[PDB]
Amino acid sequence: SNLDENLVYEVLKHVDAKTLAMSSCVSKIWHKTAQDERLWELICTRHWTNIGCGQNQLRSVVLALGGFRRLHSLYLWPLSKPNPRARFGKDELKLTLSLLSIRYYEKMS
């Protein structure tokens, strides 16, 4: 039916990664609420047991280079596509964020 912004932020909270991106394509209101990067922030944070750096610096840097949605779609999904058992650690985060920064620099001109 019809749900409010904070209502979608609650129902679309417990859907993890694939089903959220599924729900990014259904409803315009849910489209906008899925472009919200806090759900993807939580999704990406679930992949790591210990990022090794504070969340305060990580969130600003990742949103300054394109956001969490693009970080998940472009790089994390290749790294999890063959086997979803393994949990990402330091090296996976470093690799994906370096690729994201290089991609941000490519668009810079």
Binding site: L7, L12, K13, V15, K18, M22, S23, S24, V26
Partner: protein, 95 residues
């Protein structure tokens, strides 16, 4: 009211580890009875500002949403540039 009596019979039970599994069985019977009125049970929760019931009732909807195709998600709750844009931006889910 019906949703008022529902929140009483939920929250005194809340007042009333191993308890959570049969609590979730009672919750299954609950959202079975709370079906239909579930979506307006969200509005009742917003009226009341509940915390545990809100998470529990959103969990059931989330458990539904899992693994349905676009029009499936449509017909469960009765809900071309943008279509192709979202399809291409989320292609990895469909790939």
């Amino acid at each position: 009211s019906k949703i008022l009596s529902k929140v009483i019979e939920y929250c005194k039970r809340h007042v009333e580890g191993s308890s959570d599994e049969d609590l979730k069985t009672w919750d299954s019977e609950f959202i079975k009875v709370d079906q239909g009125t579930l979506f307006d049970l969200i509005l009742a929760a917003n009226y009341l500002n509940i915390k545990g019931l809100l998470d529990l009732t959103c969990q059931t909807v989330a458990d539904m949403i899992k693994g349905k195709t676009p029009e499936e998600i449509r017909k469960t709750f009765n809900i071309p540039e943008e279509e192709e844009e979202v399809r291409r931006e989320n292609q990895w889910a469909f790939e």
